Amino acid sequence: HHHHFNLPPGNYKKPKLLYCSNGGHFLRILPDGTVDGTRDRSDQHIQLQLSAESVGEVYIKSTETGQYLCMDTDGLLYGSQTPNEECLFLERLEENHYNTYISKKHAEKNWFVGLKKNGSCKRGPRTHYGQKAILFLPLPV
């Protein structure tokens, strides 16, 4: 256990949008497996369905294409048709408000899911506690 255990309220009953306070982008997983951000609320690839594996463990999946969000050994986010160890994230509360997602596999290295102000996905090694890019607010669809 290298991380705290403060959990966010809410549930996984319904799909959500993942709003990043950083640049105001919605996490998007494109059909070809490309992960990025977009401010366009009409985009069909921003609706995400999360599910828990164990308390605090989640699977973030695109309801449209059915791809799972994952992070490779270089800290790059990608979409997979099937879920593997790289697609599990530790969902936590941050600043007593937001939701953060740490790569479970690379948990000891503090790699988070994050979005830059220009809408580009941050690379694992480039993220760390205290950033805005790692802060998410799950919004209804």
From Swiss-Prot:
Signal sequence range: none
Residue span of motif Nuclear localization signal: 13-16
Tissue specificity remark: Predominantly expressed in kidney and brain. Detected at much lower levels in heart and skeletal muscle.
Consequence the record notes for mutating Y98A: No effect on integrin- and heparin-binding, loss of FGFR1-binding, defective in inducing FGF1 signaling, cell proliferation and cell migration
GO CC term (a single one): nucleus
Keywords: Acetylation, Angiogenesis, Cytoplasm, Developmental protein, Differentiation, Growth factor, Heparin-binding, Mitogen, Nucleus, Phosphoprotein, Secreted
Assembly behavior: Monomer. Homodimer. Interacts with FGFR1, FGFR2, FGFR3 and FGFR4. Affinity between fibroblast growth factors (FGFs) and their receptors is increased by heparan sulfate glycosaminoglycans that function as coreceptors. Found in a complex with FGFBP1, FGF1 and FGF2. Interacts with FGFBP1. Part of a Cu(2+)-dependent multiprotein aggregate containing FGF1, S100A13 and SYT1. Interacts with SYT1. Interacts with S100A13. Interacts with LRRC59. Interacts with CSNKA, CSNKB and FIBP. While binding with LRRC59, CSNKA and FIBP seem mutually exclusive, CSNKB and FIBP may cooperatively interact with FGF1.
Family per similarity comment: Belongs to the heparin-binding growth factors family.
Function: Plays an important role in the regulation of cell survival, cell division, angiogenesis, cell differentiation and cell migration. Functions as a potent mitogen in vitro. Acts as a ligand for FGFR1 and integrins. Binds to FGFR1 in the presence of heparin leading to FGFR1 dimerization and activation via sequential autophosphorylation on tyrosine residues which act as docking sites for interacting proteins, leading to the activation of several signaling cascades. Binds to integrin ITGAV:ITGB3.
UniProt-recorded name of the protein: Fibroblast growth factor 1
Organism name: Homo sapiens
